[PDB]
Amino acid sequence: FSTLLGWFGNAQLGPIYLGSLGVLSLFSGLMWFFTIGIWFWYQAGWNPAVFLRDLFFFSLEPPAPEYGLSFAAPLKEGGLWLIASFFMFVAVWSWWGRTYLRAQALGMGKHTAWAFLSAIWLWMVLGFIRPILMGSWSEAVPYGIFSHLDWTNNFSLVHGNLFYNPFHGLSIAFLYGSALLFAMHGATILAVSRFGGERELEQIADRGTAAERAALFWRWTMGFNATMEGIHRWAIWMAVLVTLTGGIGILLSGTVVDNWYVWGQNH
Amino acid sequence: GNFDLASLAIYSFWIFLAGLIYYLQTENMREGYPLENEDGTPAANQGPFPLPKPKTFILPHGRGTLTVPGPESEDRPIALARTAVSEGFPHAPTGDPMKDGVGPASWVARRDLPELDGHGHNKIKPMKAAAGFHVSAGKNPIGLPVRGCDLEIAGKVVDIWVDIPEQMARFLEVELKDGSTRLLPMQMVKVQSNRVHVNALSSDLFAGIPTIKSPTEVTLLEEDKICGYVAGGLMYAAPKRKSVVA
Amino acid sequence: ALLSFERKYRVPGGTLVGGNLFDFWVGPFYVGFFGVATFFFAALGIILIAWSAVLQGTWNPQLISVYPPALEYGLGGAPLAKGGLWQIITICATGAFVSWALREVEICRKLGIGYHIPFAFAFAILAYLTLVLFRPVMMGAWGYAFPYGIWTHLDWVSNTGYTYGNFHYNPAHMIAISFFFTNALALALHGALVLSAANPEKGKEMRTPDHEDTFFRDLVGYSIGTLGIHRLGLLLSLSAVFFSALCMIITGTIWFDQWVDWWQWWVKLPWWANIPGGING
Amino acid sequence: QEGDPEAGAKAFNQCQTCHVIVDDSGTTIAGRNAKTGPNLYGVVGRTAGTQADFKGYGEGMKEAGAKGLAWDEEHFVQYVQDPTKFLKEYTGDAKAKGKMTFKLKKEADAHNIWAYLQQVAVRP
Numbered sequence: 059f060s061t062l063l064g065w066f067g068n069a070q071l072g073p074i075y076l077g078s079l080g081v082l083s084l085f086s087g088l089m090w091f092f093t094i095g096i097w098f099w100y101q102a103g104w105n106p107a108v109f110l111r112d113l114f115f116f117s118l119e120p121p122a123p124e125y126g127l128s129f130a131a132p133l134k135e136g137g138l139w140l141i142a143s144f145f146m147f148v149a150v151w152s153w154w155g156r157t158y159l160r161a162q163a164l165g166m167g168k169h170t171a172w173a174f175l176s177a178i179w180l181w182m183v184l185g186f187i188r189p190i191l192m193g194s195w196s197e198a199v200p201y202g203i204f205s206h207l208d209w210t211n212n213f214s215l216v217h218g219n220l221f222y223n224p225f226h227g228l229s230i231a232f233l234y235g236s237a238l239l240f241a242m243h244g245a246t247i248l249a250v251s252r253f254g255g256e257r258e259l260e261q262i263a264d265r266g267t268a269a270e271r272a273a274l275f276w277r278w279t280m281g282f283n284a285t286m287e288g289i290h291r292w293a294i295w296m297a298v299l300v301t302l303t304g305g306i307g308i309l310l311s312g313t314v315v316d317n318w319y320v321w322g323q324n325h
Numbered sequence: 326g327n328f329d330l331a332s333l334a335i336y337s338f339w340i341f342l343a344g345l346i347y348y349l350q351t352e353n354m355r356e357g358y359p360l361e362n363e364d365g366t367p368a369a370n371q372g373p374f375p376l377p378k379p380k381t382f383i384l385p386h387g388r389g390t391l392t393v394p395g396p397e398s399e400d401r402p403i404a405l406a407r408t409a410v411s412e413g414f415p416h417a418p419t420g421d422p423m424k425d426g427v428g429p430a431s432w433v434a435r436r437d438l439p440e441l442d443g444h445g446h447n448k449i450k451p452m453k454a455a456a457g458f459h460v461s462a463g464k465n466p467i468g469l470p471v472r473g474c475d476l477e478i479a480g481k482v483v484d485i486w487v488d489i490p491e492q493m494a495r496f497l498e499v500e501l502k503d504g505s506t507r508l509l510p511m512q513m514v515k516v517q518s519n520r521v522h523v524n525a526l527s528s529d530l531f532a533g534i535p536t537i538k539s540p541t542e543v544t545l546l547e548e549d550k551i552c553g554y555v556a557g558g559l560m561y562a563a564p565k566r567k568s569v570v571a
Numbered sequence: 572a573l574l575s576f577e578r579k580y581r582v583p584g585g586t587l588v589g590g591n592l593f594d595f596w597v598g599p600f601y602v603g604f605f606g607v608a609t610f611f612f613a614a615l616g617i618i619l620i621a622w623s624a625v626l627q628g629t630w631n632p633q634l635i636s637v638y639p640p641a642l643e644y645g646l647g648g649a650p651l652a653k654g655g656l657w658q659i660i661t662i663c664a665t666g667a668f669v670s671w672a673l674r675e676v677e678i679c680r681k682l683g684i685g686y687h688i689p690f691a692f693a694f695a696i697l698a699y700l701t702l703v704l705f706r707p708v709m710m711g712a713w714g715y716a717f718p719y720g721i722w723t724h725l726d727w728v729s730n731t732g733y734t735y736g737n738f739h740y741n742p743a744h745m746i747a748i749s750f751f752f753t754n755a756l757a758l759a760l761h762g763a764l765v766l767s768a769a770n771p772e773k774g775k776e777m778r779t780p781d782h783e784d785t786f787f788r789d790l791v792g793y794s795i796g797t798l799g800i801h802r803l804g805l806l807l808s809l810s811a812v813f814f815s816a817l818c819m820i821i822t823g824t825i826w827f828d829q830w831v832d833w834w835q836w837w838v839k840l841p842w843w844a845n846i847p848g849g850i851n852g
Numbered sequence: 853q854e855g856d857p858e859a860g861a862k863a864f865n866q867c868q869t870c871h872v873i874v875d876d877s878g879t880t881i882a883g884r885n886a887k888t889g890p891n892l893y894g895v896v897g898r899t900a901g902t903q904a905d906f907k908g909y910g911e912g913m914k915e916a917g918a919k920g921l922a923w924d925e926e927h928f929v930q931y932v933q934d935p936t937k938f939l940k941e942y943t944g945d946a947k948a949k950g951k952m953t954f955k956l957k958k959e960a961d962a963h964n965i966w967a968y969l970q971q972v973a974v975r976p
């Protein structure tokens with residue numbers, strides 16, 4: 059019935075509300091961390107001193123390619139990995155849903171959900187979408203500190219050097235751009251805080267000298283500027299393009315293009 | 326008969342990008358446009374970007390609405406006069422920049438009401454009226470003498486105006502010699518051990534600081550008057566600023 | 572050619588050099604003494620690049636590439652066609668960047684705002700100089716600097732990287748990265764928070780900054796406030812570039828082997844170095 | 853069969869981010885001027901860790917050549933799948949480390965590339 063939902067809907071952690079989707083997410087998030095810790099302790103021979111010295115070297119690898127997209131692999135040969143991915147899939151998606159309903163509850167736009175969705179997009183391509191299009195779980199990313207890095211290094215070399223993948227190049231421009239853009243903005247708002255500049259919502263509803271000086275600073279500098287609201291529209295796009303363009307760039311690696319260097323010499 | 330899916334996608338992206346930039350640039354034209362001649366008349370040459378369609382903003386606490394883009398509000402005589410017959414040169418103040426409100430001393434005709442918080446109460450309140458705010462930020466300025474860049478005392482700290490919601494001090498209230506009080510922006514004062522130093526203003530410019538009506542609340546318009554004025558002193562109170570500034 | 576509120580701000584003063592000589596605009600752009608300075612440096616460099624493209628014989632922007640002197644030159648000069656142009660172009664580039672920053676300072680003065688912007692920009696310049704000046708000078712040769720070419724500089728990143736195995740193992744590189752990612756995540760959230768409040772569900776009033784706080788704390792666990800969030804963004808962004816500079820000024824100057832070997836100091840700690848088992852046992 | 857030169861030539865592309873194949877005349881058979889790894893021309897039947905120009909050989913690689921390791925298809929295929937594991941076994945040592953930071957997954961490509969090396973990288 060509704061009483062149960064209502065009961066969960068009032069779940070909290072101090073003054074912050076967790077709600078139904080939040081409880082399912084934290085629970086789902088624990089099982090994930092429990093599946094990886096259980097495998098890590100095993101690899102450490104249940105020895106805490108070994109667990110701490112090799113912490114970064116442990117890795118929960120995916121099923122071998124001979125298993126395709128099946129769920130046959132035994133626990134210690136891809137079984138655990140599959141379980142951990144399931145739980146993580148639910149934790150993330152539950153949290154996404156929580157962000158959508160919470161915005162709805164406070165009567166706000168869904169901008170946060172949309173931006174989050176872009177991050178989820180790259181994650182979905184690395185561990186779910188791409189492996190399925192390649193035909194095997196073995197193509198997915200391992201759960202480990204150093205191992206997922208080794209995975210990243212190998213993925214590039216195998217595909218002809220990702221520096222030649224135009225989408226990896228766009229993704230980078232946007233990553234640097236995000237840093238270039240938060241420095242400018244963060245610095246612009248601090249430079250006019252002496253005029254209440256940080257109160258952006260009020261500067262939008264009733265422009266002040268702080269917002270005008272921010273604009274003129276850049277107009278005189280680079281020839282153009284933005285408004286107190288529009289600046290945040292550049293910000294959200296500059297940041298979501300990082301994972302949008304790159305997800306596309308990885309989804310194209312190995313499925314459409316085998317060697318980016320070669321592809322690049324042709325175009 | 327096929328095609329390269331990668332060359333297609335990277336081609337589609339740039340189209341999308343060009344389209345995104347157009348959207349973003351027109352979106353940033355809800356304030357300040359149309360452009361004008363240094364005279365005040367439209368420029369006719371507004372550029373390759375057109376103004377967006379009007380959007381209405383419904384202000385909370387029943388403060389009304391706001392539609393942009395629209396008629397440029399900016400209303401108050403600008404005590405500035407041409408310096409050249411050609412465009413692209415400075416406009417020199419005709420009177421007293423500090424008192425006229427131009428240059429780094431400029432302020433904007435904002436709504437003459439205080440900023441409200443979620444509950445509908447004033448966002449900024451004098452600490453000796455706050456709902457239980459104690460001075461634990463470190464050093465307490467209440468009681469200290471305030472001096473200017475001329476190295477002369479202009480008054481003393483009487484109270485602290487705190488921003489309830491964000492919970493931080495935004496103004497230092499200082500009693501001038503004549504007994505009347507003025508508000509000083511926290512970002513414009515340095516609270517020392519035995520005093521408060523204000524490098525943006527000269528002791529004799531403290532009186533010129535715009536005053537607030539209700540002695541318990543400050544409105545947006547009053548905030549711009551004060552801040553624009555205090556900040557303008559960095560440039561205009563320069564001839565009276567003593568060296569060894571630190 | 573002015574925004575509807577610009578006029579009252581276009582007063583005289585603020586310049587750091589030349590008094591009123593250059594204190595004027597040109598369209599939307601302010602000039603100032605450092606305005607012509609930037610143009611001077613910028614033009615000369617743009618001309619030396621076009622010249623180098625002639626020596627190289629090609630107008631293809633995808634192929635033009637100005638290379639630094641060959642290692643056999645150390646830190647001395649070099650023929651114009653063999654690195655000399657690279658050295659001159661780097662001077663003009665540093666001059667143009669610096670002038671650009673000083674020109675923002677003048678603009679800050681005239682406007683009565685803080686110096687945070689040119690301060691922040693300076694971090695970017697030090698990172699640039701770290702790759703073309705400090706690091707090369709610490710290693711004994713200009714040849715260690717990267718080349719000026721759209722694609723040749725990416726190859727330089729790749730070769731330098733692999734010179735030390737997988738560069739992912741550089742600890743300062745790991746930290747820089749986490750900052751770049753955390754910055755982008757922060758930027759996304761901030762942008763989305765302001766917008767979701769200014770543009771609520773149709774029919775509703777704009778949301779309050781408290782609604783914004785309420786939602787932000789429901790996501791991260793703590794409320795940071797409007798001033799705190801812009802400070803965090805600038806902080807994250809600057810730290811990223813700080814640690815990047817750091818990860819490179821140390822590579823090939825005090826660390827010479829494959830970066831992964833560095834993590835031995837931790838596996839080889841007294842109390843667990845010899846315990847059998849694990850991955851390194 | 854048991855190795856395809858043409859498929860080996862294509863698979864060898866991923867190796868060009870670090871290796872090159874340049875004969876003794878100075879002519880490039882394959883490569884983009886990569887210098888991270890040694891020149892592979894003449895590697896077939898060569899003693900591991902001895903390409904005259906490569907100055908970045910590790911100790912494990914060099915001690916394997918000293919123990920008489922000469923490249924053939926058998927050892928070649930094992931090494932490219934995991935340079936470190938391969939060098940640890942062969943050398944006998946346990947803390948032996950390989951400097952090649954790449955792993956060829958498919959054993960088929962290992963044989964194909966080797967067939968490509970015999971076709972263009974054998975020093976007569």
Ligand code: BCL
Pocket residue numbers: 226227228230231232234235238617620699702717721722724725728
């Ligand atoms: C330590 C980091 C490495 C490095 C690693 C990489 C990697 C990795 C990549 C790039 C990429 C790029 N790099 Mg780089 N790059 C370095 C230093 C530089 C310097 C410099 C003077 O220091 C410059 C001007 C560039 C410029 C560029 C751009 C051409 C390109 C994407 C823009 C970008 O990231 O914007 C961030 C800023 C913005 C988006 C804001 C607007 C800035 C505009 C876009 C810059 C114009 C650059 C212009 C074409 C060249 C100007 C020269 C003058 C005409 C003479 N790099 C250093 C040596 N660079 C990407 C690419 O696709 O390359 C082919 C890429 O993937």
Ligand code: BCL
Pocket residue numbers: 146149150177178180181210211212213214215219220221226229230233300301302303304305307308728752
């Ligand atoms: C040798 C290695 C290759 C290489 C191989 C790759 C590969 C392979 C990839 C990249 C990708 C990226 N590369 Mg690269 N890259 C190289 C060199 C570079 C250089 C450089 C100066 O050399 C730069 C600047 C970059 C930059 C980038 C970024 C633009 C991009 C990642 C976006 C991102 O951060 O998403 C961050 C966001 C996510 C990963 C989303 C997932 C997050 C999930 C949704 C949330 C988890 C919640 C969780 C439960 C809680 C866990 C908490 C933690 C335990 C703390 N690369 C070299 C040439 N690169 C990626 C790409 O294309 O991205 C688009 C990519 O796949």
Ligand code: BCL
Pocket residue numbers: 210234668695696698699701702727728729731732733737738739744747748751812814815816817818819
């Ligand atoms: C195979 C290659 C190696 C590798 C090799 C290297 C090397 C080598 C370097 C990095 C560096 C970096 N790497 Mg790495 N890196 C690898 C993989 C990665 C991955 C990943 C997902 O795999 C990531 C996320 C990163 C991330 C990073 C960044 C932390 C760092 C970039 C510094 C920076 O942003 O300066 C940003 C700021 C600047 C570059 C300032 C310069 C800008 C100037 C001041 C302004 C330009 C003005 C312009 C001329 C005018 C524009 C035109 C006008 C508008 C018309 N690397 C792989 C493992 N990496 C670099 C670093 O730390 O550098 C210090 C570096 O040198």
Ligand SMILES: CC[C@H]1c2cc3[nH]c4c(c3C)C(=O)[C@H](C(=O)OC)c4c3nc(cc4[nH]c(cc(n2)[C@@H]1C)c(C(C)=O)c4C)[C@@H](C)[C@@H]3CCC(=O)OC/C=C(\C)CCC[C@@H](C)CCC[C@@H](C)CCCC(C)C
Pocket residue numbers: 234235237238241242245279280609612613614616617660661663664667668671675688689691692693694695718719720721724808809812
């Ligand atoms: C914390 C540091 C971050 C940051 C901050 C930052 N950048 C800034 C600012 C700030 C605060 C500014 O105020 C300033 C700005 O005006 O706003 C856009 C700027 C700026 N950041 C820029 C670029 C930039 N920033 C970057 C990065 C970053 N900027 C960091 C992430 C990057 C990269 C690679 O990540 C780039 C490409 C410029 C657009 C702009 C400064 C404009 C400038 O300096 O102009 C000088 C003059 C010219 C127009 C001509 C230069 C022509 C020649 C003289 C030289 C070029 C030759 C050679 C050096 C280039 C070879 C290129 C090849 C490698 C392709």
Ligand code: HEM
Pocket residue numbers: 215733863864866867868869870871888889890895899900901902903908909910911913914928932949950951952953954956965
């Ligand atoms: C591509 C699948 C590939 C092949 C094949 C390959 C082979 C190979 C051999 C046979 C050696 C030994 C050479 C000798 O003894 O003379 C060797 C050595 C190194 N390699 Fe390699 N290699 C391939 C790819 C790559 C890639 C992509 C890199 C760079 C990330 C790389 C690097 C190296 C290095 C370094 C060495 C020397 C190793 C040492 O001394 O331990 N290889 N490779």
Ligand SMILES: CCCCCCCCCCCC[N+](C)(C)[O-]
Pocket residue numbers: 169172173175176179291294298302
């Ligand atoms: C693969 C799906 C990823 C979705 C990325 C969506 C980004 C949209 C972000 C909100 C855009 C807001 N707006 C109005 C300012 O443009």
Ligand SMILES: CCCCCCCCCCCC[N+](C)(C)[O-]
Pocket residue numbers: 091094095098184185199200201202203206
């Ligand atoms: C208790 C150990 C905690 C291990 C945390 C491991 C984080 C590595 C994350 C990279 C794997 C990413 N993913 C989703 C693609 O699989």
Ligand SMILES: CCCCCCCCCCCC[N+](C)(C)[O-]
Pocket residue numbers: 223224225227228231235295296
């Ligand atoms: C909305 C922000 C506008 C940013 C525009 C950034 C352009 C940088 C382009 C880098 C060139 C990338 N590459 C490989 C595709 O050529």
Ligand SMILES: CCCCCCCCCCCC[N+](C)(C)[O-]
Pocket residue numbers: 493494495511512
């Ligand atoms: C009372 C609120 C007014 C804000 C005062 C700012 C205190 C932060 C001081 C550290 C920053 C110092 N500074 C000058 C180097 O930027």
Ligand SMILES: CCCCCCCCCCCC[N+](C)(C)[O-]
Pocket residue numbers: 621624630631632635
């Ligand atoms: C509309 C296309 C005509 C382009 C006009 C641009 C002139 C600027 C040329 C500078 C770039 C020179 N080049 C070849 C070295 O790249």
Ligand SMILES: CCCCCCCCCCCC[N+](C)(C)[O-]
Pocket residue numbers: 669672673676686687689690693
């Ligand atoms: C020719 C002057 C030598 C100084 C070169 C330094 C340029 C960096 C300017 C950044 C401005 C920094 N700040 C906060 C002090 O104004």
Ligand SMILES: CCCCCCCCCCCC[N+](C)(C)[O-]
Pocket residue numbers: 620632635636637719720721
């Ligand atoms: C006439 C071609 C149209 C011009 C397109 C613009 C290309 C930008 C070229 C600048 C490349 C400069 N360089 C040396 C750093 O590579």
Ligand SMILES: CCCCCCCCCCCC[N+](C)(C)[O-]
Pocket residue numbers: 742743745746833836
């Ligand atoms: C995430 C990486 C941060 C780790 C910082 C490590 C600090 C411990 C440094 C001790 C290692 C000293 N050293 C030079 C001998 O290797």
Ligand SMILES: [Cl-]
Pocket residue numbers: 167770
């Ligand atoms: Cl919207």
Ligand SMILES: [Fe+2]
Pocket residue numbers: 243247258290761765801
């Ligand atoms: Fe903001």
Ligand code: NA
Pocket residue numbers: 110111113114837
């Ligand atoms: Na550790």
